[PDB]
Design a protein around this ligand. Structure first.
Ligand code: CLA
Ligand code: CLA
Ligand code: CLA
Ligand code: CLA
Ligand code: CLA
Ligand code: CLA
Ligand code: CLA
Ligand code: CLA
Ligand SMILES: CCCCCCCCCCCCCCCC(=O)OC[C@H](CO[C@@H]1O[C@H](CS(=O)(=O)O)[C@@H](O)[C@H](O)[C@H]1O)OC(=O)CCCCCCCCCCCCCCC
Ligand SMILES: CCCCCCCCCCCCCCCC(=O)OC[C@H](COP(=O)(O)OC[C@@H](O)CO)OC(=O)CCCCCCCCCCCCCCC
Ligand code: SF4
Ligand code: SF4
Lengths: 157, 80, 165, 741, 94, 143
């Protein structure tokens, strides 16, 4: 008799539905605790965390699949490759911020699922994206650098 | 924003108005045809360009013509 | 000889081609009996091949360096060197038959166009009328020339619909 | 209530009045052929009974009679096959030497040098080599003589006449009513047990009393003219006992539940017969008997005129969960009142079944001397693959047709159909993403291999020597099947097919079946197949789900199922109907099936088919698939270019016809491009100029010539494209296999 | 939206009638440690300007040129390495 | 004597379980449309966005994205349930603009008092030649 599929926030005329994949308590908690969905946290710190994770997870592919994977100096070459990829996605973030945030407009408000009014995410602003982009560069480069250190350390590996 | 025009060859059959899917045409009084009515396009901003009105016109040549021009969010039929 | 072409009768390549074709047929025939169906069929094919080559050489056809017959498509050149049956005579024969069919169709269309319901006459042909017009189409050259000199074979340009330029 | 035979007497008079009035079935085709479009419309709606009438009873009667006519046509075709095999074939000679004599059942007349097509197949006979496998089927059935084939042909003609008479009788004399057609319970009960079960039991009986003794003697080695006739074995338990000793006990063991006694002719061996290369006929007999019992038992589940039995509506309405709201409610009403929904389901399962048949037939050759006949094997596989693909596309088309005409929102509220239609965006978006991911990770691998090979870096390719992409799951399943006998099937003496592994089964010096190893190339081609199938499914599903409405066009259902577009507005609505989705799905299905048949051909020619010389197996292509199928250049050179020399060098021989069609098909395909890249306006204006020329000479026709409609142009283009491509592959495959097989 | 019943439209609360919800956003200023946060905001001090952040990207462009003129040779790239003999060609050519 | 009827926000919406073909983010930053009708009974109808809804007995309000969707629903109501509706355009700022039944009378019916906008008093072939209006951002139909 239970119906696990309901319209988004009870409204059945919005292009979205609530399913155990989107409205699941654990899934909602984990998705809400990500650095991207922190309206009250500084965009620079969230960007640093995102960049660190992305830079660290981006070394592996070139390490085990790069053109020089069969050479002892593959770790260094890949660290540099990840640094280059981070710099590229860095300029991508900057271009997106410069194009998206260039004007102002009386946008509509933002509320929670319960109906509590909340301010717009500071990340969606000219200065908010710039701070987030700067943190992504420091975190992204640090993540790639840590990826090389883990290769040298880590007794198992 | 397309350009919709009505010519005096219209016979006031009102078929183009009934065939419009965005309510762009309407019938207004006239005295050049037996029906004593002519077609008009007061809301061309809502015209999408489907040309359904032309497929319903029985006059030869057509009394209603649609010239596709600058595309807008409404003329492109975008819901996103 | 017209354009450096050698008659097929004195062409060595032509004879070699005939010999090779007959040789291949006999090689295939060697794998059968003497009075079986495949043997008789192969023998008939051999006879037809020999007859074809002999007829081509006897008809006066021209063969090139490759040993294959070549056709002369030029009046005067084919008429003075005895090659009118290559393209000239076939051209006349075609033109005649093609004009016959075209004239029969034109007459049928014009005859049924005067009927109260011509579209039905077009999808449901009138067999007796079509037969009579097909027979009358054999005199198409005379009829066409008479209609042309009479002026009834053409439609006035002012009576034919045209685009608004 | 109460299932019964309800029929209407003399509903339609039998005369030729309507034969002389083309377009009588359609109301819109009554104004006569004013333009040439009327002629095309006459044929495009001849079988669209939904438009000719609004009564479901008349539509059902028309469908029933059309089915009878189709059955009669199929019977005529079967009669022709048997007659040709009895009068213009070398079946009798082929029986004495089935490994060297090539089957032939067509003879051409000598008119314009075409007698060259009468190849020297063998046995003092000349004709066209056939690849339908009729000789193997007849041998498995124990035909032996040509008189039996002639008798079968005459019987097929009689059956065709009976089918045509049945159609005429059921449409003009005794026409069943609508309530008679809506007896899904009775129809299923009769089709399960009375049709499939009874047919399987009858075939098992024939195999026991005709196929087993005759084939056993043939395999042991006995002249076909010396084997006793089928009736001498069917009505004489003494001789049949001489061949199968369990028959000395009669039917007593069957009724005493001592079935083990029948283990001599009802075995569960497996593998293939080493003499003929096909499945053991005893195993097939046992299989048919088991499936017959299963079908007969299954034909007793639905309720009819008695209390016992289940109700389809009750079972459907009782299957509802928390994720599907109402559930299967309303499905019974849809499947009992809409012919298109039933046609869609039946076409989908029918095509899938045809594909499964192709797979099971090449894997486990069921007929004697069939596996060693490479031409027949390849032809049967490719033919069934194409039939399955076409049927699947048709299933999608009819699903869209039902969604456009027979769909009713008031009857499908909160059920499976309504819930599916309420989240079509998520389904289509996810299917689109999976299609893109598959395309990348499947084709990009080939592109990467090509780039590495061209750059002189073979160590960076996705091959068995460099980065390996082993199909561990497929290999595990294959080995599991190989180890099944004696473990997870103790009563099995061998595996179902030698492809799972084991020894090499060769007949007459040619490999009939052998293990098929899977490597990186197999992994790549399988992912290519998955990607193509997914794209075809995406196109068909998108058309079915958006056939009614869409964000771009909210009233697409009002425009119908087959319309060219909705004008040039909104940027363009070209090919937005469901018919157009089917039109594109046809191209994608052709692409998928083409890659599938190419993969099968190359794999069998490189790792299965070949010859045994006491020193190993000499495959046709030498096993170049495992080292060249990982790149597109390998497929173009080692498969398309290397294997095409047989069809381009067939001039002057018996296979010359294959060389002609090979070119002709190439033409038709290219011809289709004219209708696929063009528009109606250009041709209409060109026709205007030609019409002026005709009017100038008073030869203009009253039936105003008009260019083919947009939908007709697309249909012609797709039909020509598929005909040309399929015919090209057909000619190439047949010439290559008939020249090296 | 005032969806207290079956009304999903409200001019006085039009913000809620257009589905303008964060869905997963949550404002919370108590998470990252003050000592670690200071270190990162300090490291990315002046790098928050478009011109300055682009300068960091410009370094990547210099690294690309550095690789071609030095990095490619240090990894013993085949293009920067040597060549062995040659061929003559189809006919008497080079 | 006709005045545009005001849009009531207290009108209940039809019974619908929800779908993914509804309003997106365009309605929050651009505009959306609202169709309100009156039904004499609770009955199932087909929505332009996919699925089936149930219109209540009385006033019904439905918010859609494009105006064409509202007009398609109105056409379905007029040709299937003989129900007349009103279409309005709502902007994010909160402005409502009356639409379709502009003067209370359907466009297919002449009302005598409308604007004869875009009505040339010539034939289609009596337009100025394209060469006579060159170097002017206008087409021959606008002269
Ligand atoms: C082609 C994909 C790919 C490849 C080749 C690698 C390869 C590698 N990863 Mg990796 N990773 C990947 C995708 C990939 N990853 C993805 C999609 C994620 C999640 C976003 C991660 C997250 C991840 C983590 C957290 C770690 C690795 C680590 C590693 C390294 C440890 C290998 C070992 O020695 O054991 C290795 C070079 C480990 C490492 O030491 O980093 C160098 C490590 O801890 N990976
Ligand atoms: C279709 C185009 C065509 C072409 C390219 C030729 C070409 C030729 N014709 Mg020819 N001819 C044609 C049509 C054509 N003819 C037709 C339609 C007729 C029927 C009336 C003839 C009847 C004809 C005769 C009777 C003769 C030729 C001859 C010739 C050859 C030399 C005459 C010449 O061109 O000198 C120059 C032409 C001038 C007008 C000057 C020459 C190769 C002559 C020949 O056989 O060569 C020995 C020859 O006597 N033609
Ligand atoms: C249903 C499928 C089918 C197909 C595709 C064919 C195809 C063919 N048949 Mg066949 N045939 C069939 C059914 C079929 N037949 C059946 C059911 C019978 C039993 C009655 C026959 C009995 C038959 C005979 C006796 C012969 C053929 C022959 C032929 C070949 C030449 C036919 C021809 O051009 O004659 C002429 C074309 C015509 C249009 C004239 C036909 C006039 C008949 C009487 C019309 C009957 C209605 C051809 C490849 C001939 C052959 O094999 O040549 C060696 C041959 O002699 N067929
Ligand atoms: C001589 C017997 C006979 C006669 C006089 C009629 C007469 C009539 N029938 Mg009938 N019918 C018959 C036998 C007959 N039928 C049989 C045997 C069947 C079973 C298949 C049917 C099933 C049937 C149905 C379902 C219907 C009719 C209908 C009709 C009426 C109009 C349709 C019509 O005939 O158009 C002319 C038809 C033709 C000229 C021939 C049809 C095309 C044939 C069958 C194709 C055969 C395929 C062939 C092999 C070619 C395909 C391959 C090719 C490309 C090489 C008409 C009065 C229709 C009706 O009542 O109208 C409302 C109706 O729907 N019939
Ligand atoms: C044991 C009973 C029985 C049997 C054997 C069949 C058999 C068949 N039915 Mg049928 N049916 C039955 C009961 C049965 N039905 C009942 C009770 C109903 C009412 C609920 C229906 C309603 C029905 C419909 C609506 C249709 C069929 C169709 C078919 C054919 C499908 C074609 C095919 O793939 O098969 C293989 C083809 C063959 C094996 C050809 C051989 C045909 C032999 C003669 C079997 C004939 C069996 C028949 C029922 C005998 C009684 C007829 C008698 C009065 C002379 C098939 C021959 C379809 C069809 O094609 O129409 C003809 C179809 O449209 N049936
Ligand atoms: C439909 C399939 C079929 C048919 C037609 C037959 C027919 C026959 N079988 Mg057979 N059999 C079959 C399937 C079949 N079998 C299967 C699947 C098996 C494996 C278990 C066997 C195993 C078997 C054995 C071991 C033997 C036969 C034998 C026979 C012959 C005499 C038996 C008999 O009862 O007379 C005919 C049967 C019928 C006419 C069936 C009618 C149904 C009922 C009984 C009558 C009508 C209903 C009644 C009025 C109520 C006979 C020609 C015997 C024989 O003589 O060997 C040659 C024999 O020893 N069969
Ligand atoms: C049991 C199978 C089956 C059945 C009963 C139907 C039945 C029907 N289909 Mg359908 N369909 C099927 C399978 C089937 N289809 C498959 C497998 C496909 C995928 C290709 C389609 C795709 C399809 C589409 C896209 C459409 C239909 C439509 C229709 C309806 C009208 C058909 C008609 O009269 O058009 C006329 C029939 C013809 C003009 C016959 C022409 C035959 C083709 C064009 C020639 C092919 C050449 C052939 C292979 C031989 C080549 C040799 C040549 C050189 C001589 C009808 C109820 C139409 C509809 O509107 O539905 C309501 C519609 O548009 N079908
Ligand atoms: C047209 C110019 C161009 C140039 C100059 C290059 C150059 C290069 N490509 Mg590339 N590529 C190009 C176009 C180009 N590509 C295009 C159009 C495509 C799409 C088809 C690709 C797709 C492609 C792939 C898939 C790959 C390459 C790879 C490489 C590198 C070769 C391997 C190597 O040297 O080890 C490693 C290279 C280095 C160690 C130097 C690069 C890092 C520098 C120093 C950046 C400095 C930033 C610093 C961290 C701050 C090399 C630097 C391979 C690679 O290794 O990825 C990088 C490889 O995987 N390319
Ligand atoms: C080819 C062209 C090359 C161009 C090179 C441009 C380089 C960037 C530049 O000059 O920025 C100029 C800015 C100006 O800031 C300014 O710095 C000023 C102070 S001072 O002038 O720098 O002293 C300050 O007052 C002002 O607010 C601030 O905006 O200076 C910086 O802040 C650069 C600091 C960079 C620190 C991060 C380096 C990367 C860290 C990676 C972490 C992991 C690595 C392992
Ligand atoms: C490789 C496997 C090949 C299949 C492709 C799988 C990809 C398809 C993913 C699309 C999922 C869409 C979700 C629909 C969501 C949906 O349908 O709603 C949920 C659905 C509804 O069930 P109800 O509770 O409503 O049941 C009442 C029913 O009678 C009425 O429908 O229940 C399911 O979970 C279906 C299972 C979906 C998951 C299928 C995966 C099954 C695993 C098979 C694994 C095979 C290989 C391993 C064997 C060892
Ligand atoms: S083109 Fe379409 S929307 Fe525009 S006036 Fe004509 S019918 Fe209406
Ligand atoms: S369809 Fe043509 S004739 Fe009829 S009202 Fe419209 S413009 Fe006039």
């Amino acid at each position: 008799k239970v119906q696990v599929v309901q319209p988004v926030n009870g409204d059945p005329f919005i292009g979205m539905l609530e399913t155990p994949v989107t409205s699941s308590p654990a899934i909602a908690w984990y998705l809400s605790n990500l650095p991207a969905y922190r309206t009250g946290v500084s965009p620079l710190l969230r960007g640093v965390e995102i960049g660190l994770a992305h830079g660290y997870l981006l070394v592996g592919p070139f390490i085990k699949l790069g053109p020089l994977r069969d050479v002892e100096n593959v770790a260094e070459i890949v660290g540099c490759i990840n640094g280059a990829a981070t710099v590229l996605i860095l300029t991508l973030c900057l271009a997106y911020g410069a194009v998206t945030f260039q004007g102002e407009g009386p946008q509509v408000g933002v509320k929670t699922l319960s109906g509590r009014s909340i301010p717009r995410d500071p990340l969606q602003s000219a200065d908010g994206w710039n701070k987030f982009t700067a943190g992504f560069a420091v975190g992204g480069l640090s993540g790639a650098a840590w990826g090389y250190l883990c290769t040298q350390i880590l007794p198992y590996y | 924003s397309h350009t919709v025009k009505i010519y005096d060859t219209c016979i006031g059959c009102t078929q183009c108005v009934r065939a419009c899917p965005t309510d762009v045409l309407e019938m207004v009084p006239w005295d050049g045809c037996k029906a004593n009515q002519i077609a008009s396009a007061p809301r061309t901003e809502d015209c999408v360009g489907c040309k359904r009105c032309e497929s319903a016109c029985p006059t030869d040549f057509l009394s209603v013509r649609v010239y596709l021009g600058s595309e807008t969010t409404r003329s492109m039929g975008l819901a996103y | 000889d017209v354009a450096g072409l050698t008659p097929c009768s004195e062409s060595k390549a032509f004879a070699k081609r005939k010999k090779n074709e007959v040789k291949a047929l006999n090689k295939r025939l060697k794998n059968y009996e003497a009075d079986s169906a495949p043997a008789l069929a192969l023998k008939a094919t051999i006879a037809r091949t020999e007859a074809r080559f002999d007829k081509y050489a006897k008809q006066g056809l021209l063969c090139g360096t490759d040993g294959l017959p070549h056709l002369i498509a030029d009046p005067g050149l084919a008429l003075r060197y005895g090659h009118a049956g290559d393209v000239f005579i076939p051209t006349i024969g075609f033109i005649y038959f093609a004009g016959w069919l075209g004239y029969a169709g034109s007459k049928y269309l014009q005859a049924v166009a005067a009927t109260a319901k011509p579209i039905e006459k077009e999808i449901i042909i009138d067999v007796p009328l079509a037969w009579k017009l097909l027979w009358e189409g054999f005199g198409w050259p005379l009829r066409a020339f008479a209609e042309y000199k009479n002026g009834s074979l053409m439609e006035d340009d002012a009576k034919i619909t045209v685009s608004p330029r | 209530k109460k299932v019964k035979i309800v029929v209407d007497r003399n509903p339609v008079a039998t005369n030729f009045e309507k034969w002389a009035k083309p377009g009588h079935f359609s109301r819109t085709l009554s104004k006569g052929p004013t333009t040439t479009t009327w002629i095309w419309n006459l044929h495009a709606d001849a079988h669209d009974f939904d438009t000719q009438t609004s009564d479901l009873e008349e539509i059902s009667r028309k469908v029933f009679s059309a089915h009878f006519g189709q059955l009669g046509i199929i019977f005529i075709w079967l009669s022709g096959m048997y007659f040709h095999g009895a009068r213009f074939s070398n079946y009798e000679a082929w029986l004495t030497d089935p490994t060297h004599i090539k089957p032939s059942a067509q003879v051409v007349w000598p008119i314009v040098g075409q007698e060259i097509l009468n190849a020297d197949v063998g046995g003092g006979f000349q004709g066209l080599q056939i690849t339908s496998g009729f000789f193997q089927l007849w041998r498995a059935a124990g035909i032996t003589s040509e008189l039996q084939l002639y008798t079968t042909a005459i019987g097929a003609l009689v059956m065709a006449a009976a089918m045509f008479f049945a159609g005429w009788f059921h449409y003009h004399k005794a026409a069943p009513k609508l309530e008679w057609f809506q007896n899904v319970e009775s129809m299923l009960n009769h089709h399960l047990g009375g049709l499939l079960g009874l047919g399987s039991l009858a075939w098992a009986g024939h195999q026991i009393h005709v196929s087993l003794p005759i084939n056993k003697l043939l395999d042991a080695g006995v002249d076909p003219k010396e084997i006793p006739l089928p009736h001498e074995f069917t009505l004489n338990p003494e001789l049949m006992a001489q061949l199968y000793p369990s028959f000395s006990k009669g039917l007593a063991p069957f009724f005493t539940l001592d079935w083990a006694q029948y283990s001599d002719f009802l075995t569960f061996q497996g593998g293939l017969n080493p003499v003929t290369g096909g499945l053991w006929l005893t195993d097939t007999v046992h299989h048919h008997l088991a499936i017959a019992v299963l079908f007969l038992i299954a034909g007793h589940q639905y309720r009819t005129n008695w209390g016992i039995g289940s109700s389809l509506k009750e079972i459907l309405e009782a299957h509802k969960g928390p994720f599907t709201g109402e559930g299967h409610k309303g499905l019974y009403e849809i499947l009992t009142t809409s012919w298109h929904a039933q046609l869609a389901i039946n076409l989908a399962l029918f095509g899938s079944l045809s594909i499964i048949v192709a797979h099971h037939m090449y894997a486990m050759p069921p007929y004697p001397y069939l596996a060693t006949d490479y031409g027949t094997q390849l032809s049967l596989f490719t033919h069934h693959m194409w039939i399955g693909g076409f049927c699947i596309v048709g299933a999608g088309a009819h699903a869209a047709i039902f969604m456009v005409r027979d769909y009713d929102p008031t009857n499908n509220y909160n059920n499976l159909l309504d819930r599916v239609l309420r989240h079509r965006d998520a389904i289509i978006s996810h299917l689109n993403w999976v299609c893109i991911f598959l395309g990348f990770h499947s084709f990009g691998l080939y592109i990467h291999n090509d780039t590495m090979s061209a750059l002189g870096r073979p160590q960076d390719m996705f091959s068995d020597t460099a980065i390996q992409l082993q199909p561990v799951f497929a290999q595990w399943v294959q080995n599991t099947h190989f180890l099944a006998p004696g473990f997870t099937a103790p009563n099995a003496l061998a595996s179902t097919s030698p492809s799972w592994g084991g020894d090499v089964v060769a007949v007459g010096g040619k490999v009939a079946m052998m293990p098929i190893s899977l490597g990186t190339a197999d992994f790549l081609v399988h992912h290519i197949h998955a990607f193509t199938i997914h794209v075809t499914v995406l196109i068909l599903l998108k058309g079915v789900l958006y056939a009614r409405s869409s964000r771009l066009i909210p009233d697409k259902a009002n425009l119908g199922f087959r319309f060219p577009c909705d004008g040039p507005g909104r940027g363009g609505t070209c090919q937005v109907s469901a018919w157009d989705h089917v039109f594109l799905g046809l191209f994608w299905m052709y692409n998928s099936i083409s890659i599938v048949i190419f993969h099968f051909s190359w794999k069998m020619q490189s790792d299965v088919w070949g010859t045994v010389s006491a020193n190993g197996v000499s495959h046709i292509t030498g096993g170049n698939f495992a080292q060249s199928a990982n790149t597109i250049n390998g497929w173009l050179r080692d498969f398309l270019w290397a294997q095409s020399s047989q069809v381009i060098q067939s001039y002057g021989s018996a296979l010359s016809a294959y060389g002609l069609i090979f070119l002709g098909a190439h033409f038709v395909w290219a011809f289709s491009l004219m209708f696929l890249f063009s528009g109606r306006g250009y041709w209409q204006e060109l026709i205007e100029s030609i019409v002026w020329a005709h009017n100038k000479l008073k030869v203009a026709p009253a039936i105003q010539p008009r260019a083919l409609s947009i939908t007709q142009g697309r249909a012609v283009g797709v039909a020509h494209y598929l005909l040309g491509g399929i015919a090209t592959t057909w000619s190439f495959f047949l010439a290559r296999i008939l020249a090296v097989g | 939206k005032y969806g207290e019943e079956s009304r999903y439209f409200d001019l006085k609360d039009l913000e809620n009638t257009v589905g303008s919800w964060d869905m997963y956003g949550q404002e919370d200023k108590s998470r990252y440690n003050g000592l670690q946060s200071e270190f990162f905001e300090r490291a990315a001090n002046g790098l928050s300007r478009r011109e300055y952040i682009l300068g960091l990207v410009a370094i990547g462009g210099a690294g690309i040129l550095a690789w071609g003129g030095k990095g490619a040779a240090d990894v013993r790239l085949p293009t920067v390495g040597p060549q062995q003999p040659a061929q003559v060609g189809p006919r008497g050519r080079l | 004597a006709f005045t545009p009827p005001t849009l009531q926000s207290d009108t209940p919406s039809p019974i619908f379980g929800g779908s993914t073909g509804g309003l997106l983010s365009q309605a929050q930053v651009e505009e959306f449309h609202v169709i309100t009708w009156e039904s004499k009974k609770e009955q199932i109808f087909e929505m332009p966005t996919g699925g089936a809804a149930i219109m209540r007995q009385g006033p019904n309000l439905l918010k859609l994205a494009r105006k064409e969707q509202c007009l398609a629903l109105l056409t379905q109501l007029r040709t299937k349930f003989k129900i007349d509706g009103y279409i309005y355009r709502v902007f994010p700022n909160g402005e409502v603009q009356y639409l379709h039944p502009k003067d209370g009378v359907y466009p297919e019916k002449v009302n005598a008092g409308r604007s004869g906008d875009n009505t040339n008093m010539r034939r289609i072939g009596q337009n100025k030649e394209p060469v006579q209006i060159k170097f002017s951002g206008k087409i021959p139909a606008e002269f």
